[PDB]
């Protein structure tokens, strides 16, 4: 195979600021001056799509932000100005010599100013503790950056095993993040507890943002 | 102009399947039909090509054995058939024509290698315990992926954030939380749609104060 082998694998770039990436090629994917190189971008749950062919040039309907450059085994990426909707991870792709492979891929992060959480705590449904289970649901919404951690207590005490945890992708409107945090319980030992506290520490802030409720209430 | 795929396919290890591509707008016969394979959170990977004109294919070697490609150009359709499935062959397939300045791509096919039984959510309503307002939907249970959520049937779209689901003893979970101004809920009515294509099942459920 030829193989693509992009960098970084990860950035993060400001809005406004120019964003380069790099494929280098294992061997020349040129013939008689052309380069047969695309660039691909793709967004959270879609196919993707075509954003520069034959190395250099710009796909019809892609804005003039994207531009590719390079020769032989040597090719860049450069986005600027970089806009919020150009969150996204980037391939490169030979079509030189079967097999027609792609990069390892490179995640664009667009760095915005940083946020705190909504943080948000709901007990139990009735129909689903009538049903036999017990989930208390803690969402953590609209936060930057990425990193971040929930801690869960019942009646003062941590509680680890039987979290579930999942994170959106980045927002292409506003830059930032979210994530649902879950704690899984048997309904006895739900109704055995009063109260259930859901605790989020977020780099803007050393005091956590906490919030609960009593079952009882 | 669109490469049309084949449905959702949940198949069990060790079995084969068989996926199907078919343009609208062209023929298969006058180009390349290319299939791309993505696992869960991976990257692209090329597993080859076939010119439907003169039946040559090529392949990644990686999938050479497994893979085979076809087509047949009376029915305008070119074919994917992958055996001695295992988990590692869970993931979206790509129909794509790439070609050197213009590519179509299809919109993907999922296939899921598993034995674990095809299960309907149960949806319940997440309403505060006591400016804006958040309100959710925990969808518990189903299997396979996916479920698509909406709210007021796609009339809320604004302030909604659904979360990847995440597998447990064979069954997926995920919830979805809504925004909204305080002054419209609990007034004016709010409900999360949850459709489950593997068990032509959807549920609409309303947000009720507790």
């Known amino acids: 195979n030829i193989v693509l082998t992009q960098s970084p694998p990860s950035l993060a770039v400001s809005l406004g600021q120019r964003a380069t990436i790099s494929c280098r090629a294992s061997?020349?994917?040129?013939?008689?001056?052309?380069?047969?190189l695309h660039w691909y971008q793709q967004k959270s749950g879609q196919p993707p799509k075509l954003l520069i062919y034959l190395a250099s040039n710009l796909e019809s309907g892609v804005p003039a932000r994207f531009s590719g450059s390079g020769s032989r085994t040597d090719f860049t990426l450069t986005i600027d100005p970089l806009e919020a909707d150009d969150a996204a991870t980037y391939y490169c792709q030979q079509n030189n010599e079967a097999p027609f492979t792609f990069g390892s891929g490179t995640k664009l992060e667009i760095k915005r100013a940083d946020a705190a959480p909504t943080v948000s705590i709901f007990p139990p449904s009735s129909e689903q503790l009538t049903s036999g289970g017990a989930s208390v649901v803690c969402f953590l919404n609209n936060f930057y950056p990425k990193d971040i951690n929930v801690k869960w207590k019942i009646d003062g005490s941590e509680r680890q095993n039987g979290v579930l945890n999942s994170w959106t992708d980045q927002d292409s409107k506003d830059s930032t993040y979210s994530m649902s945090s879950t704690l899984t319980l048997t309904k006895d030992e739900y109704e055995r507890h009063n109260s259930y506290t859901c605790e989020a520490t977020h780099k803007t802030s050393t005091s956590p943002i906490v919030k609960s409720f009593n079952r009882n209430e | 102009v669109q490469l049309q795929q084949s449905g959702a396919e949940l198949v069990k290890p060790g079995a084969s399947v068989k996926l199907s591509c078919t343009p609208s707008?062209?023929?298969?016969?006058?180009?390349?039909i290319h299939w791309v394979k993505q696992r869960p959170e991976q990257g692209l990977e090329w597993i080859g090509m076939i010119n439907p004109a003169n039946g040559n294919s090529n392949y990644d070697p990686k999938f050479q054995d497994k893979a085979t490609i076809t087509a047949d150009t009376s029915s305008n359709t070119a074919y994917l058939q992958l055996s001695s499935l295992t988990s590692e062959d869970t993931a979206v397939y790509y129909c794509?024509?790439?070609?050197?300045?213009?590519?179509?791509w299809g919109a993907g096919t999922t296939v899921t290698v598993s034995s674990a039984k095809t299960t309907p959510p149960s949806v319940y309503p997440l309403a505060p315990g006591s400016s804006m307002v958040t309100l959710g939907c925990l969808v518990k249970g189903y299997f396979p992926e996916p479920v698509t959520v909406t709210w007021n049937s796609g009339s809320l779209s604004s302030g909604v954030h659904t979360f990847p689901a995440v597998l447990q003893s064979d069954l997926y979970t995920l919830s979805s939380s809504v925004t909204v101004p305080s002054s419209t809920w609990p007034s004016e009515t709010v409900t999360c749609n949850v459709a489950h294509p593997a068990s032509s099942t959807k549920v609409d459920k309303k947000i009720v104060p507790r």
């Open positions: 707008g062209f023929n298969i016969k006058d180009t390349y």
């Open positions: 061997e020349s994917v040129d013939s008689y001056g052309n380069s047969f």
């Open positions: 794509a024509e790439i070609t050197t300045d213009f590519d179509v």
